[PDB]
Amino acid sequence: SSGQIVTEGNSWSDYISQIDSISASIILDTENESYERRVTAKNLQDPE
Amino acid sequence: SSGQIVTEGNSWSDYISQIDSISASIILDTENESYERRVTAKNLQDPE
Amino acid sequence: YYNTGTAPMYKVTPTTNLVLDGDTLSTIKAQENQIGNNLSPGDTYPKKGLSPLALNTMDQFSSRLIPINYDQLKKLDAGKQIKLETTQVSGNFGTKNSSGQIVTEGNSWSDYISQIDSISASIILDTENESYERRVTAKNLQDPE
Amino acid sequence: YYNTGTAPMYKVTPTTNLVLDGDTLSTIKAQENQIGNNLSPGDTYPKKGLSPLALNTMDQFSSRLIPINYDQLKKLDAGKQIKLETTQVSGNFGTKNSSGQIVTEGNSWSDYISQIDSISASIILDTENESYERRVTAKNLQDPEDKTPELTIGEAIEKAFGATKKDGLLYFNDIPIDESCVELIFDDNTANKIKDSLKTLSDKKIYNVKLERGMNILIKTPTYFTNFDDYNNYPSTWSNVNTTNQDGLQGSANKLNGETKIKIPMSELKPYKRYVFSGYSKDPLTSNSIIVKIKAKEEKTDYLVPEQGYTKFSYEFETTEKDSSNIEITLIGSGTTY
Amino acid sequence: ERKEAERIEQKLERSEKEALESYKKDSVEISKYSQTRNYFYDYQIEANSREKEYKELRNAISKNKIDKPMYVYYFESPEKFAFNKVIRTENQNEISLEKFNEFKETIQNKLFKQDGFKDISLYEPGKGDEKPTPLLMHLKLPRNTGMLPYTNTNNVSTLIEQGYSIKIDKIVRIVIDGKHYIKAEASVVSSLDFKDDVSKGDSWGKANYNDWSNKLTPNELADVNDYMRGGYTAINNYLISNGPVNNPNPELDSKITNIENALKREPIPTNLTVYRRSGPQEFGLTLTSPEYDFNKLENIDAFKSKWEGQALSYPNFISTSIGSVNMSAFAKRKIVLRITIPKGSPGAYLSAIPGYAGEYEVLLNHGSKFKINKIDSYKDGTITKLIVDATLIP
Amino acid sequence: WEDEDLDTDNDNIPDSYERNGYTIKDLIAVKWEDSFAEQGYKKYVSNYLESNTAGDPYTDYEKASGSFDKAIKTEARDPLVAAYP
Amino acid sequence: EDLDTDNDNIPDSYERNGYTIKDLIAVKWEDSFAEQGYKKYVSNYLESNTAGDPYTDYEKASGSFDKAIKTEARDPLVAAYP
Amino acid sequence: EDLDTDNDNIPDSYERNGYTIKDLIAVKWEDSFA
Ligand SMILES: [Ca+2]
Ligand SMILES: [Ca+2]
Ligand SMILES: [Ca+2]
Ligand SMILES: [Ca+2]
Ligand SMILES: [Ca+2]
Ligand SMILES: [Ca+2]
């Protein structure tokens, strides 16, 4: 909240699997540019 | 505590022996995929 | 590696001797390539059904092979064998931290080896399939306390 | 590695010298391959029944062998030997937590070695096949604010080696270690202090001298000893003894008209080692001398003139045979001495 | 666990950083201010130079919590467990069997509450730790409690704020490095309390007791309102004068029975603490009595000696104020009663209904029994007022 | 002193239980009654002046109650036998 | 009295005149104790570590150190030293 | 009742007889929940 940013010890590999497990991958491929996105999807098997 | 995920200092070898000591091994071998599970089994000689 | 006690060992790092006739050719502490992560009582590293591990490096970073003399090579080529003697083994035990997770870093059996061996009696049971080693605490009759 | 102290050492990392004639070829500090995890007092790493470890690397990561020159190789093959000396040993001690959680990392003995040596006296007991070394704290008289308790040499030995007092005399396990039943070896400073304190002392016994800092006392138990009272270690038998009176240091005379003979079969002595034959001789009244004959390698003759009290002669001999006939010592000379 | 501390200190902004820095060098005085804070007027609690410190320290402590109950350990003075004696002095080693016996009998069934910042640890007090008192208590914190560890120059210690009452089951004698200590096991009791949350207390009262009158016939509601509006100084005096024994009569017995039934109709769903500014005449003391003068220490000591651990009872209708701030109508009274109301106990909020029903007024059954746990005092200007930790007994 | 609530070594087992005999049920030390044997309970005794009778890193209560690594043999659960590889 | 200047949990008079350890508590020495295997200890009452080793006088006397240390190093005047 | 011996936020009776998680708080099992 004071504007300090720390990146040491904050690894993306701890979140890659969790993100990919509950997301749906959507890609937009336009001319000379591409985008990759992940959108959270509901699991209907789980009532909670 | 903050909702973050940490993987440094969390080793599976600390739990491998304990899991293997109190569990049973069940393997399901279907086509093009195999599943290995450990299910905890009760010790009858221990009243506690 | 094999275990015959009552407790498991983590990060098993033994030290061994190589003796030809009366010469200790080298003593090597296990490097990263020869460390067993788990070793349960009655188990074996590598597990039963797997091939033995190769011990062929002597330096800290596993980059220096184990050399022998020309005369020692002549002794080997005449039929003499090399014996292996384990002098000591390093390892860890698991406790629970403040949150209740099992931790093995910082816990060492070498801290307790001397204390256990000083106040105990050693009993070995030898059966055909396997043998068991135990330590049972004995009382010092000369100490009223 | 071996330990003769009272406390174990964890992670034993000694530094050694290699000397050929007058050169120090190298000084290697032990790497991970040559570190002993546990070393209990009286034990040995590697444990008894295991081959010695190999020390053949000199760098920090055990990747460089120990080289020598052409001249040193010629010296080595000429028959000259390389000696080894230990200069220091690094190790750890274990602090016990209230729950019994032993921790040894970060607990160095080198932080206490100098302080312990500064305020203590070293006492060594050199028995057969086993030795012990202790440090006993001593008081400093120059400082009035030092309140450590005072101990004499006898009390210091009794506390340091766990000696047992039977009748005022100290026994280690079943061996007498009283000052008259052993050999006391001091350095020059301790000898000067003992002599300057005995003349001031009243009872005139070494064990009653107050212990002081820097003293170096070495106690050696005898191979064979006789007091003619309750202890006989000699393998053979003396030719003629006399034990019918309360004389000597303790109730023993062993003197008559005849002369004493002993023949050690030499099968129970060291092959090439140098020995000393000691004792106490007394005459109530001034009399003749004593003809002491020793025959181990060459027969040496010495003349002994005793006094009103008891004195030690400690006549000295040499054996270099391991196969020859018996060892002959005689104490010719009569006149009702003790 | 300095790794976790450095992970959790970065998320603290500058204000929490300065609060913790001020705490680290002045822990004792900030804590001493923290126990006695909410009993002053509505003005002092906003015009001090440390109120912001207390607020931001509470914010920092409640920023991070614990997901499961875990044990904590610390040294507590026996003076906070209703023991005015000393068990074993600093230079002595062993404790007497007798002193153990009175110490155990003094805390048989008595709940004690703490309301200040304090330093606790998650480990047994091994070597390298200082030992203020011969008392040792192993405390069991529940789920979701304030937990903000901080680090010193070399070591790490934790800080929490207490808003609960703790009960000790058993005490034993233990030996730590050659000295005798008393080991107590205690648990944390959940409840609800509003030290200064006027808005939150009002919201809770209106949320619970808005539907209170919907179950009552209009005649009984009108009777209750009329009785609390016009005859509050009549029926209470009649009950105090021992009416049923001296002059039995049904015209007031009907009122007593109706009010008792209405108050017993609805018990609380959750434990709360109510504050009654008791008058000296209630304890049978008068403003001219030397024992009443609480300015001196000896009168406080005597009142504690003769009234701590004793029983109390209120033959009148009990009126309590949920607020902890000093009120104009009850300014001159030195004794504030800290009644702890456990679940299933009688009590109804009377401020949910419209109109000016009083000052957070709450009515309970007449003749109710009270248990006194501890008696402590604070500086109030020049005078010292009095707090009693009353307990409601069925 | 004469009562059954002394914990001189501070390991959650009273001195009398350690001297005479005890067992663990519901993670609480209780007196040993001989009828417990037919139910499969084991009778334990241990040093009441030492928190680790056998010298291993686990206390007498931890060993007796089985509040340690599940991979350790059940023989090492009584305080007189050391958990030792 | 109950004075303890070095804070090693042994009273000054006890250290000065003699003491023994029983039930983890320092008590005065009596002549009848020596027949039961007890030992009489005297130590510096102005130093917590009389012998200069990493163990205090109470720790040495009580035996609350490593069990592998020799028994003769349990008195405060003989140092535990490898 | 309200007894939690192992301190894992689930009461002992629920663990013995069966439970389920709704809104991150454990509740008694009922055959309708299946
Ligand atoms: Ca004699
Ligand atoms: Ca106990
Ligand atoms: Ca115990
Ligand atoms: Ca002292
Ligand atoms: Ca001292
Ligand atoms: Ca549970």
Tab-separated table of N, CA, C and O in Angstrom, chain E residues 268-350:
chain	number	residue	atom	x	y	z
E	268	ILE	N	-30.320	-15.064	25.333
E	268	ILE	CA	-29.349	-14.604	24.343
E	268	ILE	C	-28.875	-15.790	23.511
E	268	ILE	O	-28.825	-16.921	24.015
E	269	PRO	N	-28.527	-15.585	22.237
E	269	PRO	CA	-27.918	-16.670	21.457
E	269	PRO	C	-26.402	-16.730	21.556
E	269	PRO	O	-25.816	-17.737	21.134
E	270	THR	N	-25.750	-15.698	22.091
E	270	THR	CA	-24.295	-15.627	22.108
E	270	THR	C	-23.847	-14.844	23.335
E	270	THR	O	-24.507	-13.896	23.766
E	271	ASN	N	-22.703	-15.247	23.888
E	271	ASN	CA	-22.208	-14.658	25.124
E	271	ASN	C	-21.861	-13.188	24.921
E	271	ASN	O	-21.203	-12.825	23.941
E	272	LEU	N	-22.296	-12.342	25.853
E	272	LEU	CA	-21.973	-10.922	25.827
E	272	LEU	C	-21.612	-10.457	27.230
E	272	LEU	O	-21.967	-11.088	28.228
E	273	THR	N	-20.889	-9.342	27.294
E	273	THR	CA	-20.516	-8.714	28.554
E	273	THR	C	-21.214	-7.367	28.663
E	273	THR	O	-21.119	-6.539	27.751
E	274	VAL	N	-21.908	-7.152	29.777
E	274	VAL	CA	-22.634	-5.913	30.014
E	274	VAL	C	-21.966	-5.157	31.155
E	274	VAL	O	-21.349	-5.739	32.052
E	275	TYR	N	-22.095	-3.832	31.111
E	275	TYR	CA	-21.441	-2.936	32.060
E	275	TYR	C	-22.505	-2.215	32.876
E	275	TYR	O	-23.308	-1.453	32.326
E	276	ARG	N	-22.511	-2.456	34.182
E	276	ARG	CA	-23.360	-1.735	35.120
E	276	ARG	C	-22.498	-0.845	36.002
E	276	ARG	O	-21.566	-1.327	36.654
E	277	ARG	N	-22.811	0.449	36.021
E	277	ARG	CA	-22.172	1.384	36.944
E	277	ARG	C	-22.914	1.288	38.271
E	277	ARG	O	-23.872	2.016	38.529
E	278	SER	N	-22.471	0.359	39.115
E	278	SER	CA	-23.116	0.140	40.401
E	278	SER	C	-22.853	1.307	41.344
E	278	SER	O	-21.784	1.925	41.326
E	279	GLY	N	-23.847	1.607	42.176
E	279	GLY	CA	-23.725	2.655	43.158
E	279	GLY	C	-23.146	2.148	44.461
E	279	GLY	O	-23.266	0.968	44.803
E	280	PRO	N	-22.491	3.035	45.214
E	280	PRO	CA	-21.946	2.622	46.518
E	280	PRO	C	-23.005	2.116	47.478
E	280	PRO	O	-22.716	1.241	48.304
E	281	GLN	N	-24.228	2.646	47.395
E	281	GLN	CA	-25.301	2.182	48.267
E	281	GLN	C	-25.677	0.735	47.972
E	281	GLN	O	-26.201	0.039	48.850
E	282	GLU	N	-25.426	0.268	46.747
E	282	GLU	CA	-25.698	-1.126	46.414
E	282	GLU	C	-24.813	-2.077	47.210
E	282	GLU	O	-25.280	-3.136	47.646
E	283	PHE	N	-23.544	-1.722	47.413
E	283	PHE	CA	-22.631	-2.504	48.236
E	283	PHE	C	-22.747	-2.169	49.719
E	283	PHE	O	-21.933	-2.646	50.518
E	284	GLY	N	-23.738	-1.370	50.099
E	284	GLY	CA	-23.895	-0.963	51.485
E	284	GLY	C	-22.801	-0.047	51.989
E	284	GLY	O	-22.388	-0.162	53.151
E	285	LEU	N	-22.321	0.861	51.144
E	285	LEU	CA	-21.319	1.841	51.531
E	285	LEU	C	-21.818	3.234	51.173
E	285	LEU	O	-22.592	3.418	50.231
E	286	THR	N	-21.357	4.217	51.941
E	286	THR	CA	-21.826	5.588	51.818
E	286	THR	C	-20.625	6.495	51.571
E	286	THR	O	-19.494	6.177	51.949
E	287	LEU	N	-20.889	7.636	50.928
E	287	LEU	CA	-19.827	8.526	50.469
E	287	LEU	C	-18.935	9.018	51.603
E	287	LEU	O	-17.800	9.432	51.345
E	288	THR	N	-19.415	8.986	52.842
E	288	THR	CA	-18.634	9.433	53.988
E	288	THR	C	-17.818	8.317	54.628
E	288	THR	O	-17.127	8.570	55.620
E	289	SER	N	-17.880	7.099	54.097
E	289	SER	CA	-17.166	5.984	54.706
E	289	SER	C	-15.698	5.993	54.283
E	289	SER	O	-15.391	6.208	53.108
E	290	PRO	N	-14.773	5.775	55.223
E	290	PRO	CA	-13.348	5.735	54.853
E	290	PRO	C	-13.005	4.610	53.893
E	290	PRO	O	-12.110	4.777	53.055
E	291	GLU	N	-13.686	3.465	53.995
E	291	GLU	CA	-13.436	2.364	53.070
E	291	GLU	C	-13.884	2.707	51.656
E	291	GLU	O	-13.402	2.106	50.690
E	292	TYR	N	-14.811	3.658	51.515
E	292	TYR	CA	-15.287	4.039	50.190
E	292	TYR	C	-14.243	4.833	49.417
E	292	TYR	O	-14.211	4.770	48.183
E	293	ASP	N	-13.386	5.577	50.113
E	293	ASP	CA	-12.416	6.444	49.450
E	293	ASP	C	-11.374	5.593	48.737
E	293	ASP	O	-10.458	5.059	49.369
E	294	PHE	N	-11.498	5.486	47.417
E	294	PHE	CA	-10.615	4.648	46.617
E	294	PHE	C	-9.356	5.376	46.166
E	294	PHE	O	-8.553	4.794	45.429
E	295	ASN	N	-9.170	6.631	46.582
E	295	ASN	CA	-7.955	7.354	46.224
E	295	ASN	C	-6.720	6.679	46.808
E	295	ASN	O	-5.690	6.560	46.134
E	296	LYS	N	-6.805	6.226	48.055
E	296	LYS	CA	-5.688	5.538	48.678
E	296	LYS	C	-5.625	4.086	48.210
E	296	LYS	O	-6.620	3.496	47.778
E	297	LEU	N	-4.425	3.511	48.300
E	297	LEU	CA	-4.227	2.126	47.891
E	297	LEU	C	-4.800	1.139	48.899
E	297	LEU	O	-5.229	0.044	48.514
E	298	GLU	N	-4.817	1.504	50.184
E	298	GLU	CA	-5.241	0.561	51.212
E	298	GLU	C	-6.725	0.240	51.113
E	298	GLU	O	-7.126	-0.893	51.392
E	299	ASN	N	-7.555	1.210	50.724
E	299	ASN	CA	-8.978	0.928	50.565
E	299	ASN	C	-9.226	-0.019	49.398
E	299	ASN	O	-10.065	-0.923	49.494
E	300	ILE	N	-8.508	0.172	48.290
E	300	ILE	CA	-8.603	-0.761	47.170
E	300	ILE	C	-8.167	-2.153	47.608
E	300	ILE	O	-8.817	-3.157	47.285
E	301	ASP	N	-7.065	-2.230	48.360
E	301	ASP	CA	-6.577	-3.519	48.842
E	301	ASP	C	-7.599	-4.192	49.751
E	301	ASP	O	-7.833	-5.400	49.647
E	302	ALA	N	-8.220	-3.426	50.649
E	302	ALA	CA	-9.205	-3.993	51.562
E	302	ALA	C	-10.450	-4.463	50.819
E	302	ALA	O	-10.990	-5.536	51.118
E	303	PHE	N	-10.925	-3.669	49.854
E	303	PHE	CA	-12.099	-4.070	49.089
E	303	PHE	C	-11.813	-5.341	48.305
E	303	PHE	O	-12.654	-6.246	48.236
E	304	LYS	N	-10.620	-5.428	47.709
E	304	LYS	CA	-10.216	-6.646	47.016
E	304	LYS	C	-10.130	-7.828	47.974
E	304	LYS	O	-10.557	-8.939	47.642
E	305	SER	N	-9.587	-7.611	49.173
E	305	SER	CA	-9.449	-8.707	50.125
E	305	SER	C	-10.808	-9.239	50.565
E	305	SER	O	-10.992	-10.455	50.693
E	306	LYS	N	-11.772	-8.349	50.800
E	306	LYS	CA	-13.051	-8.777	51.355
E	306	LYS	C	-14.130	-9.030	50.310
E	306	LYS	O	-15.220	-9.481	50.676
E	307	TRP	N	-13.875	-8.757	49.029
E	307	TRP	CA	-14.946	-8.878	48.047
E	307	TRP	C	-14.536	-9.623	46.780
E	307	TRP	O	-15.401	-10.057	46.013
E	308	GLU	N	-13.238	-9.779	46.537
E	308	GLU	CA	-12.799	-10.610	45.422
E	308	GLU	C	-13.055	-12.074	45.753
E	308	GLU	O	-12.649	-12.559	46.816
E	309	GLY	N	-13.733	-12.777	44.848
E	309	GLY	CA	-14.095	-14.160	45.062
E	309	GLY	C	-15.369	-14.371	45.850
E	309	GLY	O	-15.809	-15.519	45.989
E	310	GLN	N	-15.973	-13.306	46.370
E	310	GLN	CA	-17.215	-13.421	47.112
E	310	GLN	C	-18.410	-13.435	46.162
E	310	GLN	O	-18.303	-13.100	44.980
E	311	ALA	N	-19.558	-13.830	46.701
E	311	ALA	CA	-20.785	-13.865	45.924
E	311	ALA	C	-21.516	-12.529	46.008
E	311	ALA	O	-21.379	-11.769	46.971
E	312	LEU	N	-22.304	-12.247	44.972
E	312	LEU	CA	-23.105	-11.035	44.903
E	312	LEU	C	-24.499	-11.398	44.415
E	312	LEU	O	-24.696	-12.432	43.772
E	313	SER	N	-25.470	-10.546	44.737
E	313	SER	CA	-26.846	-10.770	44.317
E	313	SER	C	-27.564	-9.433	44.217
E	313	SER	O	-27.237	-8.489	44.939
E	314	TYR	N	-28.541	-9.364	43.316
E	314	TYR	CA	-29.310	-8.143	43.073
E	314	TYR	C	-30.799	-8.421	43.221
E	314	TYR	O	-31.458	-8.825	42.246
E	315	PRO	N	-31.379	-8.219	44.407
E	315	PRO	CA	-32.821	-8.469	44.573
E	315	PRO	C	-33.698	-7.570	43.718
E	315	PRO	O	-34.871	-7.901	43.498
E	316	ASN	N	-33.174	-6.449	43.236
E	316	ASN	CA	-33.920	-5.534	42.387
E	316	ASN	C	-33.921	-6.043	40.945
E	316	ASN	O	-33.341	-7.084	40.627
E	317	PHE	N	-34.576	-5.304	40.053
E	317	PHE	CA	-34.473	-5.564	38.623
E	317	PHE	C	-33.139	-5.040	38.112
E	317	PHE	O	-32.803	-3.868	38.317
E	318	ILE	N	-32.384	-5.908	37.449
E	318	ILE	CA	-31.038	-5.575	36.999
E	318	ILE	C	-31.137	-4.745	35.727
E	318	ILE	O	-31.796	-5.144	34.762
E	319	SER	N	-30.486	-3.587	35.726
E	319	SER	CA	-30.384	-2.731	34.552
E	319	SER	C	-28.914	-2.613	34.176
E	319	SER	O	-28.086	-2.239	35.013
E	320	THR	N	-28.590	-2.936	32.928
E	320	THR	CA	-27.213	-2.931	32.461
E	320	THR	C	-27.077	-2.077	31.210
E	320	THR	O	-28.009	-1.963	30.409
E	321	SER	N	-25.902	-1.474	31.057
E	321	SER	CA	-25.548	-0.708	29.871
E	321	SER	C	-24.507	-1.480	29.076
E	321	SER	O	-23.434	-1.803	29.596
E	322	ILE	N	-24.828	-1.782	27.817
E	322	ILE	CA	-23.892	-2.520	26.976
E	322	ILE	C	-22.663	-1.670	26.670
E	322	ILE	O	-21.560	-2.194	26.481
E	323	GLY	N	-22.829	-0.350	26.624
E	323	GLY	CA	-21.700	0.521	26.366
E	323	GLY	C	-20.719	0.546	27.523
E	323	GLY	O	-21.078	0.369	28.687
E	324	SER	N	-19.451	0.773	27.186
E	324	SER	CA	-18.373	0.827	28.163
E	324	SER	C	-17.909	2.246	28.465
E	324	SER	O	-17.004	2.423	29.285
E	325	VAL	N	-18.497	3.251	27.827
E	325	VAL	CA	-18.061	4.631	28.006
E	325	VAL	C	-18.772	5.237	29.209
E	325	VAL	O	-19.895	4.849	29.551
E	326	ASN	N	-18.107	6.183	29.868
E	326	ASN	CA	-18.713	6.854	31.009
E	326	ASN	C	-19.819	7.791	30.541
E	326	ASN	O	-19.635	8.582	29.611
E	327	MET	N	-20.971	7.700	31.194
E	327	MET	CA	-22.150	8.459	30.812
E	327	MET	C	-22.368	9.617	31.775
E	327	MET	O	-21.938	9.576	32.931
E	328	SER	N	-23.033	10.662	31.277
E	328	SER	CA	-23.326	11.819	32.114
E	328	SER	C	-24.230	11.442	33.279
E	328	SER	O	-24.011	11.882	34.413
E	329	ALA	N	-25.248	10.620	33.020
E	329	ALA	CA	-26.173	10.204	34.065
E	329	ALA	C	-25.517	9.326	35.123
E	329	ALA	O	-26.041	9.240	36.239
E	330	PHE	N	-24.399	8.677	34.805
E	330	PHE	CA	-23.690	7.814	35.746
E	330	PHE	C	-22.226	8.222	35.828
E	330	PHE	O	-21.324	7.380	35.841
E	331	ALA	N	-21.973	9.533	35.876
E	331	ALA	CA	-20.601	10.028	35.877
E	331	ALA	C	-19.928	9.840	37.232
E	331	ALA	O	-18.755	9.453	37.299
E	332	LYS	N	-20.648	10.106	38.324
E	332	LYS	CA	-20.015	10.179	39.636
E	332	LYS	C	-19.737	8.814	40.250
E	332	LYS	O	-19.051	8.747	41.275
E	333	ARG	N	-20.243	7.733	39.662
E	333	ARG	CA	-20.119	6.410	40.262
E	333	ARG	C	-18.749	5.821	39.945
E	333	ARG	O	-18.323	5.811	38.785
E	334	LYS	N	-18.062	5.327	40.978
E	334	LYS	CA	-16.708	4.808	40.829
E	334	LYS	C	-16.661	3.328	40.475
E	334	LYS	O	-15.626	2.861	39.988
E	335	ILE	N	-17.738	2.584	40.700
E	335	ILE	CA	-17.733	1.133	40.554
E	335	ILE	C	-18.501	0.777	39.290
E	335	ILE	O	-19.691	1.095	39.168
E	336	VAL	N	-17.821	0.121	38.354
E	336	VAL	CA	-18.427	-0.388	37.130
E	336	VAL	C	-18.355	-1.908	37.170
E	336	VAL	O	-17.287	-2.482	37.417
E	337	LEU	N	-19.492	-2.556	36.951
E	337	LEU	CA	-19.612	-3.999	37.087
E	337	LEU	C	-19.503	-4.631	35.704
E	337	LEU	O	-20.279	-4.295	34.803
E	338	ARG	N	-18.530	-5.526	35.535
E	338	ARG	CA	-18.281	-6.179	34.251
E	338	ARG	C	-18.927	-7.561	34.281
E	338	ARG	O	-18.291	-8.574	34.575
E	339	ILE	N	-20.216	-7.597	33.968
E	339	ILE	CA	-20.993	-8.828	34.042
E	339	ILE	C	-20.792	-9.592	32.744
E	339	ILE	O	-20.975	-9.037	31.655
E	340	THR	N	-20.419	-10.864	32.849
E	340	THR	CA	-20.273	-11.732	31.687
E	340	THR	C	-21.508	-12.617	31.582
E	340	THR	O	-21.775	-13.425	32.478
E	341	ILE	N	-22.255	-12.465	30.492
E	341	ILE	CA	-23.512	-13.178	30.289
E	341	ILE	C	-23.241	-14.335	29.330
E	341	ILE	O	-22.974	-14.089	28.143
E	342	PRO	N	-23.296	-15.583	29.782
E	342	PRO	CA	-23.077	-16.724	28.887
E	342	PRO	C	-24.363	-17.096	28.155
E	342	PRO	O	-25.453	-16.642	28.494
E	343	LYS	N	-24.215	-17.950	27.145
E	343	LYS	CA	-25.334	-18.325	26.291
E	343	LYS	C	-26.435	-19.014	27.091
E	343	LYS	O	-26.175	-19.766	28.035
E	344	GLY	N	-27.680	-18.745	26.701
E	344	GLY	CA	-28.832	-19.310	27.373
E	344	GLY	C	-29.257	-18.592	28.632
E	344	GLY	O	-30.168	-19.068	29.319
E	345	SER	N	-28.629	-17.458	28.958
E	345	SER	CA	-28.912	-16.680	30.152
E	345	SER	C	-29.985	-15.633	29.874
E	345	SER	O	-30.146	-15.184	28.733
E	346	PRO	N	-30.734	-15.236	30.903
E	346	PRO	CA	-31.781	-14.228	30.710
E	346	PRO	C	-31.204	-12.874	30.325
E	346	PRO	O	-30.069	-12.533	30.660
E	347	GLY	N	-32.015	-12.101	29.607
E	347	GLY	CA	-31.628	-10.768	29.191
E	347	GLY	C	-32.263	-10.358	27.879
E	347	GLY	O	-32.278	-11.135	26.920
E	348	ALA	N	-32.790	-9.137	27.823
E	348	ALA	CA	-33.450	-8.626	26.631
E	348	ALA	C	-32.980	-7.205	26.360
E	348	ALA	O	-32.891	-6.391	27.283
E	349	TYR	N	-32.686	-6.912	25.096
E	349	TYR	CA	-32.283	-5.572	24.685
E	349	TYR	C	-33.525	-4.695	24.595
E	349	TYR	O	-34.478	-5.029	23.884
E	350	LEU	N	-33.523	-3.576	25.319
E	350	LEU	CA	-34.677	-2.685	25.334
E	350	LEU	C	-34.507	-1.466	24.437
E	350	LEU	O	-35.428	-0.647	24.362
